[PDB]
Symmetry: C2
Subunit: 194 residues, 2 copies
């Protein structure tokens, strides 16, 4: 029933733009919406990837590898899955493995790749692939993992056991001012609920 | 170590604004970011998203989701029930209220996250994730009456919790919908548990 009629640019920054969206509602009436989009999306199947990195080591419990970094939009530190935008011509898998290595030092193995999923669909058109990757932490490559941060990238690695993820996240939030990402919290809540 | 120095308004709509954030990087170098904010926040968070666990004896437990046209996305998305928290509303009350308006179900609160970020590289948007159980055998949830406000047009989709990820992949392959990243993350973790 519903569809886009027009998209009018309101303001276009270097990285983000705002649009006035006109659409047809299902009563047959015309309505508008204020829409955010990135300026960086070309032919990628999504804007970005977020990596679910399951660190596996003999005689260790499985960990989920997370990162902490300052996020200017939030004005503070956030704890997230490793993530980045997909470079033009780059596959989501390759982007995932690359971002994981850049942010954490770890060299992973692909497990699964989601279809493009929406980040905040009432606000923006932004999408990611969620890429599950296993890290063989017994491999020598993954012994002394050092982030290769890019220019203006400053990332801390936090590995938490999968079997206690939600409480460990709660214990981090209780100890400093910091925000957990909604996807990370959602993933931790399901681990509890299962 | 990092912090915000200043925020310049670039453009302000009715619902969304775009800012240029200046911040201090951890080397002591001054940097800028293009940040989105909502104009509606006053609250612990912008919104709530509800994880509604539909419990009916002798049935599988279902997670109740919603399908709506999302003008920023140009298409239909499958999401947790959700909405913005009203001025002077608690996150718990917003959750039960939105769950009722969007699904017709009357639920009980199980737990409530701290404020969690939606897309912290882009926006300051936050939500509380509120887990709610729904006693599907109670008479008030027999014929769930959805109360859509002005301009809401929501379809309800209940899916079994124990197969959620495969059920969502099936809808994406057949119905050309976009699944929400929080929904998908929850689904993934139900599979990855144990
Ligand atoms: C975010 N962008 N536009 C919106 C709207 N809410 C009601 C009408 S337009 N939210
Ligand atoms: C989204 N908003 N601002 C951005 C930037 N990326 C690199 C420098 S500023 N992305
Ligand atoms: Cl539950
Ligand atoms: Mg990143
Ligand atoms: Mg990066
Ligand atoms: Mg809603
Ligand atoms: Mg509403």
């Amino acid at each position: 029933k519903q569809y886009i009629i027009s998209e009018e640019l309101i303001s276009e920054g270097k990285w983000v733009k705002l649009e006035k969206t006109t659409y047809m509602d299902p009563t047959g009436k015309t309505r508008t919406w204020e829409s955010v989009k990135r300026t960086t999306r070309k032919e990628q199947t999504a804007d970005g990837v977020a990596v679910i990195p399951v660190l596996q080591r003999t005689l260790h419990y499985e960990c989920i590898v997370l990162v902490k970094q300052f996020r200017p939009p939030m004005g503070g530190y956030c704890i997230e899955f490793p993530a980045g935008l997909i470079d033009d011509g780059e596959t989501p898998e390759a982007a995932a493995l690359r971002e994981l290595e850049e942010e954490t030092g770890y060299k992973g193995d692909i497990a699964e790749c989601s279809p493009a999923v929406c980040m905040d669909p009432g606000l923006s058109n932004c999408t990611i692939h969620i890429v599950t990757v296993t890290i063989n932490g017994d491999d020598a490559e993954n012994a002394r993992p050092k982030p290769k941060p890019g220019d203006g990238e400053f990332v801390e690695v936090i590995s938490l056991p999968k079997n206690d993820l939600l409480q460990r996240l709660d214990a981090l939030v209780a100890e400093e001012h910091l925000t957990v990402d909604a996807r990370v919290y959602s993933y931790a809540l399901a681990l509890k609920h299962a």
